Ligand binder design. Structure first.
Ligand SMILES: CCCCCCCC/C=C\CCCCCCCC(=O)O[C@H](COC(=O)CCCCCCC/C=C/CCCCCCCC)COP(=O)(O)OCCN
Lengths: 83, 71
C-alpha cells in the first residue's frame, strides 16, 4: 500500500521505459480475457469459407440442413454486417 | 589650437550588454503530451477496427464468388 507506491515513484523517476513496457505487457496479457469482442473474432474466423462446402446426401430426416443457399435454414451472418 | 580627438566611449555610457544564459522553457506539460498521444492511438484503433471488419466482410463476399464458380 505504501511500499509499492514509493517503488513505482522511484521506477518512474529513473526508468520510465521499463515502467511503460511492463504496463503495456500487463495490459496485453490481461485485457483479452475480459473482453466481449474476443468471442466475435473467433466467430469471424469461423465464417470465412476457405474451402468448398461439400453438400450432404439428403437422407430424408435432415430438417435443419438447407436445400438451397437462400433457404432460411443454416447458419446466418446477419450479426456480422451489423458489426 | 585644435583639441585632442581620440576614440573614446560616448558621453555617459554605452548601452548595457546582455551576458546571462537565456534558455526559455518552451513546452507543454508531460500529462498533456501523453494524453494527446493516447487520444490519437484510440482514434486510430477505432478507425482500424471499423475498416478491418469491413475488409473481413468483403473477403467473405469474394470467397463466396469462388465457391459459386468452383463446380
Ligand atoms: C505482466 C506482463 C509482464 C511482461 C510484459 C513486459 C514485456 C517486456 C517488458 C520487460 C522486458 C525485459 C525487462 C528487463 C528488466 C531489466 C531489469 C534491470 O536490470 O533493472 C535495472 C534497473 O532497475 C529496474 O529494474 C528499474 C525499475 C524496476 C522495473 C521497472 C518497473 C517494474 C514494473 C513497473 C510497471 C508496473 C505497472 C505500472 C503501474 C502503474 C501505476 C498505478 C537496470 O538498470 P541498470 O542497467 O543497472 O542502470 C545502470 C545505469 N544507471
Amino acid at each position: 500500500a505504501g511500499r509499492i507506491a514509493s517503488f513505482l515513484k522511484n521506477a518512474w523517476a529513473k526508468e520510465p521505459v521499463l515502467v511503460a513496457s511492463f504496463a503495456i505487457g500487463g495490459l496485453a496479457i490481461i485485457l483479452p480475457s475480459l473482453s466481449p469482442y474476443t468471442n466475435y473474432a473467433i466467430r469471424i474466423n469461423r465464417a470465412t469459407p476457405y474451402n468448398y462446402p461439400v453438400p450432404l446426401r439428403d437422407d430424408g430426416n435432415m430438417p435443419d440442413v438447407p436445400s438451397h443457399p437462400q433457404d432460411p435454414q443454416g447458419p446466418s451472418l446477419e450479426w456480422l454486417k451489423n458489426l | 589650437a585644435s583639441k585632442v580627438k581620440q576614440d573614446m566611449p560616448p558621453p555617459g555610457g554605452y548601452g548595457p550588454i546582455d551576458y546571462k544564459r537565456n534558455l526559455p522553457r518552451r513546452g507543454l506539460s508531460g500529462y498533456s503530451m501523453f494524453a494527446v498521444g493516447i487520444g490519437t492511438l484510440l482514434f486510430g484503433y477505432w478507425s482500424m477496427m471499423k475498416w478491418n471488419r469491413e475488409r473481413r466482410r468483403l473477403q467473405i463476399e469474394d470467397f463466396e464468388a469462388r465457391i459459386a464458380l468452383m463446380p
